[PDB]
């Protein structure tokens, strides 16, 4: 019985990267050719394991993490990367054993005048550890002066909205991302 990936892949709504979605699935089969040839994928890399032996593998559960980021932020979804996404939103460990799938979804996730739904984290005191999630909304203090919840100079709201206009360059257009973690 192959795994039920359409529930996370074909889901009509995706989550922001800062409140990224985690779905576990148990006791099933993951074939590489069966899902590579599933659709139009702009990013499909597998670390740790080998794609060809994906269904020669045994594991307890599979966590299918999923979120929406923008095109030139997909390269951050990798081990040992850095930047706003991989430091404040979704860190992958250095020993990651699994896969990263991405694809363009301007047509789904962009609205004329903007799709102000998908958010991302812009600041944080410290670097997320692998698979840590944070949806706190505290005023990020950037200087010595305390913020006190009141926004202003060196006192920023930690979250911003993507533009996600269908007019933007593919560079800064919505991308659907699913991360398959095997443990």
């Amino acid at each position: 019985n192959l795994c039920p990936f359409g529930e996370v892949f074909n889901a009509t709504r995706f989550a922001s990267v800062y409140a990224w979605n985690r779905k576990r699935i148990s006791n099933c089969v993951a074939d590489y050719s069966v899902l590579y040839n599933s659709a139009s994928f702009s990013t499909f890399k597998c670390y740790g394991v080998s794609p060809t032996k994906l269904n020669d593998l045994c594991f307890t559960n599979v966590y299918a993490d999923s979120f929406v980021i923008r095109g030139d932020e997909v390269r951050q979804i990798a081990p040992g990367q850095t930047g706003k996404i991989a430091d404040y939103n979704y860190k992958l460990p250095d020993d990651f054993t699994g896969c990263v799938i991405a694809w363009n979804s301007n047509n789904l996730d962009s609205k004329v005048g903007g799709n102000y739904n998908y958010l991302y984290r812009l600041f944080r005191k410290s670097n997320l550890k692998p698979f840590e999630r944070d949806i706190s909304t505290e005023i990020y203090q950037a200087g010595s002066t305390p913020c006190n919840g009141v926004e202003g100079f060196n006192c920023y709201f930690p979250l911003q909205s993507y533009g996600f206009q269908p007019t933007n360059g593919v560079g800064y257009q919505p991308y659907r991302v699913v991360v398959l973690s095997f443990e």
């Epitope: 200087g143 010595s144 100079f153 060196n154």
Partner: single-chain antibody, 227 residues
Framework: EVQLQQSGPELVKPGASVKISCKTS????????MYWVKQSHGKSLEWFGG????????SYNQKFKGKATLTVDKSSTTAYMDLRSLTSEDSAVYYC?????????????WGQGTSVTVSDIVMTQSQKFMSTSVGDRVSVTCKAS??????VAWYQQKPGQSPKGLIY???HRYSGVPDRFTGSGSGTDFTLTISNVQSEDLADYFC?????????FGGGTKLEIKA
Amino acid sequence: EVQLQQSGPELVKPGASVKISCKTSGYTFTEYTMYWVKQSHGKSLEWFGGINPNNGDTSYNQKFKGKATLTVDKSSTTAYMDLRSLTSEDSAVYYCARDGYPYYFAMDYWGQGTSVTVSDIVMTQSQKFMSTSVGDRVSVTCKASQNVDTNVAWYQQKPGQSPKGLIYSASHRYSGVPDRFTGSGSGTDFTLTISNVQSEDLADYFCQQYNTYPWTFGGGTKLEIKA
């Protein structure tokens, strides 16, 4: 190897304008907020305003509202100030200074200064002059108008020289500051004790609050030595 290098002295005739610069190096430019501090008649320190190099965010002290514009150039890791319809007031010494957060609070690195010629909280420093001898203990007071709980710093101005941070966060010593400088205070009244006064401690000592903007200074306390 932190270095804040400002532009040279500017002599400009009244009503004109001039753009001084602060070329930084030795650290990652975009990671630390930058401030400008004005030192003029009365020989006292006036916070001028800040700029965040990462987003170009600004905050202006409203005394000088419209007197200057703060910009940065990430291409050359440089902070600029652009002055505006100068009077005789504007003749002063302007320092650029780096916010230390999160490692050291307040202004942990200053520049050499540029001599240009042509509900606020009030830090009050009782004595404008003290005299001890070497090896004596001396203390210096500041009274803040409001509550500023431990968000106070102490600076050292040796003659002809930029201020150097001594105490930050009311009681913590900056990197390289001798043990005979201890800070004490909380809430509104703060003291700076120099315990074993050395020859080289002759200087002006300024307090500063950084609880809210604008940042504000005491008037200073000349400290003079004899032996």
